[PDB]
Amino acid sequence: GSTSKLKYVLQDARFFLIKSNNHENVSLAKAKGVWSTLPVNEKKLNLAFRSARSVILIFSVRESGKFQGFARLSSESHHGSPIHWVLPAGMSAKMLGGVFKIDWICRRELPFTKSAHLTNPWNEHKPVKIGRDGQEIELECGTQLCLLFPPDESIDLYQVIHKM
Ligand SMILES: O=C(O)c1c(Cl)cccc1Oc1ccc(F)cc1
Secondary structure: OOOHHHHHHHOOEEEEEEOOOOHHHHHHHHHHOEEEOOHHHHHHHHHHHHHOOEEEEEEOOOOOOEEOEEEEEOOOOEOOOOOOOOOOOOOOHHHOOOEEEEEEEEOOOEEHHHHOOOEEHHHOOEEOOOOOOOOEEOHHHHHHHHHHOOOOOOOOOHHHHHHO
């Protein structure tokens, strides 16, 4: 299977590692195509969205040993139908910023064992699995990381390719 469409989507991308707190919220985000974060990281992502042809979120639930997929921002965050996230301990829906609409590019998992050869120059050349929530990943490392994920037959890139 050709990777030309995915390489096109990634040509001028920025990449951010999302260290999700709860697997259930990743499931919600996957199903509904929406995501939200704290205003600190939100502002950084809204700026990125204006700065690059694609902004890619690469999800890795904390302590999971895996990435759970990756998605492209379709919009800057907006404030809308409320999403009922599973709120982690000591968190409240008030702490969250607006909602990003996101188009999932892959919803299949990638174990850290499969990315162990990739290092992120923008995180001190550490293996790319290592990073805080919102860690930016350099273009080539991010591109290669996305290309390691298995093909996802539930995904059709047509809508993304049209939004571009
Ligand atoms: O990381 C998640 O589980 C998560 C996701 Cl995927 C989407 C939306 C919210 C999430 O959790 C939070 C809930 C409230 C907060 F104030 C901060 C994070």
